[PDB]
Write a protein that binds this ligand. Structure first.
Ligand SMILES: Cc1cc2nc3c(=O)[nH]c(=O)nc-3n(C[C@H](O)[C@H](O)[C@H](O)COP(=O)(O)O)c2cc1C
Ligand SMILES: Cc1cc2nc3c(=O)[nH]c(=O)nc-3n(C[C@H](O)[C@H](O)[C@H](O)COP(=O)(O)O)c2cc1C
Ligand code: SF4
Ligand code: SF4
Ligand code: FES
Ligand code: FES
Ligand SMILES: [Cl-]
Ligand SMILES: [Cl-]
Ligand SMILES: [Cl-]
Ligand code: NA
Ligand code: NA
Ligand code: NA
Ligand code: NA
Ligand code: NA
Ligand code: NA
Ligand code: NA
Lengths: 160, 416, 156, 417
């Protein structure tokens, strides 16, 4: 099955077209579209940017620069679930390091790494705006206070 | 069904912005309407736009996004320029320690929406945006749903309640950049570009989104507008001290017993925020410092200041991060340096290189690997991030850390 | 001895000239009269009958038959409260209690100042927004006492 | 201008026809209607013969939306067999409990209604048309008056419409509080400046109506379909929904559902789908106990799988859906239905006059725990004896819903006795 130019699956293309039609100008939809792409594939595939750029009526170079600039987007590692761990001042003070330890015990990985099954990636992030509930992490869109290893293990068991 | 959100504690002595948001759940339009919601909008649409501006001016309302700029005055500046005009709600909230705006978004979205509609009407904007940080996905879904609710009840769309006023609100998402909370970088992002601040002047109120007059206001600011209309400016100005009137939200975190968001008048002191409202310190340890987000460091000798926008007041966004006696100030300073390292957009050379070097060297200092030259270099870089900077980030990236050098010399000297 | 003021008589004349036959305008005229006076004055019917070219007892029978018309009680604002099945199910009684709390009157009563009369009515055709009430021509869903109070404050 | 305040009733459509504009809760004026291609169906119609229009409306399968489901084309054919002049009447009296479908067309998309009235009038050779709108819809009245003026100024009403030689005036009449003025003969009596007293039928209006002349009375919803039939053609119209009950239908849904409002749906939709698929299910997810088809029928929770069509086993009527859940007292609800008929009988027929009164009087006593044994037996008797000698549908049905509750919920009634 020889390779041919990348094309968006119909169900994804539909969603992208929806974002593009949502704002007055197509190019305003770029971040929504990139979120949608990363949601679908578990990362931003490099080959996806050219056809996205065509849909936005933007030069490819513009799209690439945007992907590079915004820290939430990941062109390198596919992962089903991103565990975003806050490493900023309040979480650090209140126990980021205990959360990271518990994550290593449960998943066998450190920040920046992906489990061997492609399931989880630990992503260190700046303040998540939940500092009263420090230390904070997210699992894709879900956000939690870390309490303990037993508690974290129960939380992660819900992601399959 | 929305993504899981931590249930941030919220408490109010005024029962305004947190009247509903003190309860940690989504309040949908029916509950909002039962509390008299959208009646302020109806009243506003029977007033002239100029009248509304006058009321917001006379209320003394100031922005809650950090700069404390008088809101009515900002509006007056926008409307002296020809239309069309745009209104933007800044929901980028990404400064360390700051989680005040999200509880309005997530729990009382109609308060924000009502404020957006009134504000848009006041400045003649028929298109409004909410720009919400990418790491608030629940807030995004909650706002999208609430907007649809408002549309169904006829508070949004064409010819709102027979007024002839048209409005659509579009919800945009960020994708991980603190700098996109700076009003001009926010606008660049809304235009589909990287979040690079623009040289000011011009200011957004003159040339903003697509080069047109644009008002950017913070979530908290906008949430005040329904109260000003409902109560009238005079009754609103009766709340708190007459020069800094009305409610303010204070996100309190770190080493307190009751971390969370407090709605209080601005004559409240910092000492009262910590000890009267937030329950005092964990383990009853002595306060060592308060970080005002990533902006300022107050010592234990500076707790008797008002939480207002006066020169000797706390100011900012009212973000209170409490460190106690056992907390290492240099370790804390490193975290602040790391934040600016990660968030400079890199357009300006001293900011780009200074934010990086400040964190790089401070890490060496903290780990006991700094040479004498690294120490001298750190001092120099910390004082030289600001030159040529075109936005506030470069101006303040060294500020808090410099204050720790001045206020806690004995801890720093331990590392040297 | 009773005569319509000129401005009202003009308006009655417009309705009477609107349809192909004069007598078709009877209900529009009665609506106009009630709007003007806050009720249907018994003495207004004789001159109306003359303009319609109808016998007085015909007009009297019409006024009697149609429930919107009121010959008994003057009121500046009629609060029409739906008492039919959907509104009853969804909280007519809460609306009525809120009205009594605010205005001090029950259905069928007029406030002493003649400002407000509560009129119980059959289904107002807004059942999805139950419980429904009108203040003269304006129609609203009742949400709560606080909400109702603000609405009523708009009528002076 | 400024119109009176109106609640913003929710509206949703899977067909995007009758509610294409009225799904948005505001007045759509003529320019907006024209931009959507409005009044082009009128232009097309005026280039057709009246007979062809009747033929298309017949072949469309369109049925009346005012409760009887009578085939519209067949009605028009009956009228045009009688010498003119003829009159066309739009029935906007909508006063049955639960029913609020017609007002959202009137208030939001008046030109849809007006265009349908003009086509319909042309089809039957009427040069005078009326809208009879209930008195408790003041906003709809002012909106229609203004829309008619807009249509006049653009040349869609008046003499010699668009050079066709066809003349039309539409007069707007208002009711003044009587449900019975929805009955097509009482409506005509009211238009003639009298009390709303139904006439003995036959003759039917299509033979002898307003001023004794052939008169077609159609419901707002019925008329609003006509522009679509001309625009699309009868074949494409008939392709909407099941071929025997084709085309859009409006369903006003209220009571204990999460999303009360008006739904534009095909008639193969089931009652269960209306409630659970479209109207969001029940408040608190409580079990459905009963659906009241306005004040006409009571369906139990064992009858939810029926189609919303005009078939023998279908829901029928005006598609009015009032949902009661497991905690709702059926006897209390029956009393509200009894009170409605008590308040609306015109009193011409003795069993209706006395029966509607006694049914309510006695049921109130039962409800309050004050009924004697004779009051109970009397209630049962009266409920079965409202209909004899009745000359209109009200007397025929004033006992129907309540009798159904007695048969379908015996245990609850037994508790009161
Ligand atoms: C680096 C930087 C980041 C900012 N982040 C935010 C933010 O997250 N939210 C916000 O409302 N304003 C933020 N601001 C301030 C805005 O530029 C602007 O002053 C504010 O949104 C105006 O609204 P206000 O007058 O209601 O405060 C930031 C400013 C700078 C310099
Ligand atoms: C008591 C009673 C009330 C009625 N109310 C209405 C009404 O409000 N609207 C309506 O269009 N038809 C109503 N009807 C039905 C009309 O008499 C008539 O069948 C209908 O207006 C014909 O139009 P259609 O064939 O388009 O349904 C009522 C009938 C009765 C017996
Ligand atoms: S001061 Fe820093 S963050 Fe601001 S524009 Fe310059 S490089 Fe970017
Ligand atoms: S059946 Fe009832 S409503 Fe109908 S004409 Fe007779 S008395 Fe009047
Ligand atoms: S410092 Fe971690 S959520 Fe704010
Ligand atoms: S039952 Fe009250 S509006 Fe219909
Ligand atoms: Cl290119
Ligand atoms: Cl006489
Ligand atoms: Cl043609
Ligand atoms: Na004023
Ligand atoms: Na003023
Ligand atoms: Na951002
Ligand atoms: Na023809
Ligand atoms: Na005529
Ligand atoms: Na009527
Ligand atoms: Na054909």
């Amino acid at each position: 099955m020889f390779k041919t130019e990348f094309e968006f699956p119909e169900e994804l293309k539909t969603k992208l077209q929806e974002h593009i039609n949502y704002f007055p100008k197509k190019r305003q939809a770029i971040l929504l579209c990139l979120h949608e792409i990363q949601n679908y594939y578990g990362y931003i595939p490099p080959e996806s940017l050219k056809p996205l750029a065509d849909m936005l009526e933007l030069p490819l170079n513009h799209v690439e620069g945007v992907v590079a600039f915004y820290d939430m987007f990941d062109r390198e590692d596919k992962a089903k679930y991103r565990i975003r761990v806050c490493v900023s001042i309040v979480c650090h003070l209140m126990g980021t390091n205990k959360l990271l330890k518990a994550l290593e015990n449960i998943l066998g990985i450190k920040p920046g790494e992906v489990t061997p099954d492609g399931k989880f990636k630990i992503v260190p992030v700046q303040c998540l705006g939940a500092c009263s509930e420090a230390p904070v992490f997210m699992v894709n869109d879900d956000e939690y206070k870390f309490e303990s290893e037993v508690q974290l293990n129960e939380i992660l068991s819900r992601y399959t | 069904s929305y993504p899981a959100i931590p249930r941030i504690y919220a408490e109010t002595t005024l029962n305004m912005l947190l009247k509903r948001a003190k309860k940690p759940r989504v309040h949908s339009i029916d509950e909002y309407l039962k509390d008299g919601g959208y009646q302020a909008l109806e009243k506003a649409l029977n007033m002239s736009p100029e009248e509304i501006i006058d009321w917001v001016d006379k209320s003394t309302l100031r922005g809650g996004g950090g700069a404390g700029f008088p809101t009515g005055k900002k509006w007056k500046f926008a409307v002296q320029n020809p239309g069309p005009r745009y209104f933007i709600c800044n929901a980028d909230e990404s400064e360390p320690g700051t989680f005040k705006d999200r509880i309005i978004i997530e729990r009382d979205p109609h308060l924000l929406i009502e404020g957006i509609i009134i504000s848009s009407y006041a400045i003649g904007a028929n298109e409004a945006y909410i720009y919400i940080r990418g790491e608030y996905p629940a807030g995004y879904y909650i706002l999208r749903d609430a907007i649809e609710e408002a549309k169904k009840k006829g508070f949004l769309g064409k010819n709102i309640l027979g007024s002839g006023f048209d409005l659509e609100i579009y919800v945009a998402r960020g994708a991980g950049a603190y700098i996109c909370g700076e009003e001009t970088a926010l606008i660049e992002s809304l235009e589909g570009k990287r979040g690079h601040p623009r040289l000011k002047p011009p200011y957004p109120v003159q040339k903003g989104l697509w080069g047109k007059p644009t008002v950017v206001n913070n979530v908290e600011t906008i949430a005040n507008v329904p109260f000003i209309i409902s109560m009238g400016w005079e009754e609103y100005r009766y709340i708190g001290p007459s020069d800094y009137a009305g409610p303010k939200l204070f996100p309190v975190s770190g080493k307190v017993k009751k971390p969370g968001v407090y709605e209080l008048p601005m004559n409240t002191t910092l000492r009262e925020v910590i000890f009267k409202y937030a329950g005092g310190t964990l383990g009853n340890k002595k306060v060592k410092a308060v970080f005002s987000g990533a902006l300022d460091c107050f010592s234990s000798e500076e707790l008797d200041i008002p939480m207002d926008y006066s020169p000797l007041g706390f100011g900012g966004t009212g973000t209170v991060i409490v460190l106690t006696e056992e907390d290492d100030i240099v370790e804390a300073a490193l975290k602040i340096a790391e934040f600016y390292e990660h968030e400079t957009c890199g357009q300006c050379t001293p900011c780009r290189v200074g934010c990086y070097e400040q964190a790089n060297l401070l890490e060496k200092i903290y780990k006991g690997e700094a040479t004498e030259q690294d120490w001298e270099g750190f001092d120099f870089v910390n004082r030289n991030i600001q030159p040529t900077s075109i936005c506030g980030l470069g101006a303040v990236a060294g500020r808090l850390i410099r204050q720790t050098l001045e206020k806690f010399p004995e801890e720093w000297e331990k590392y040297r």
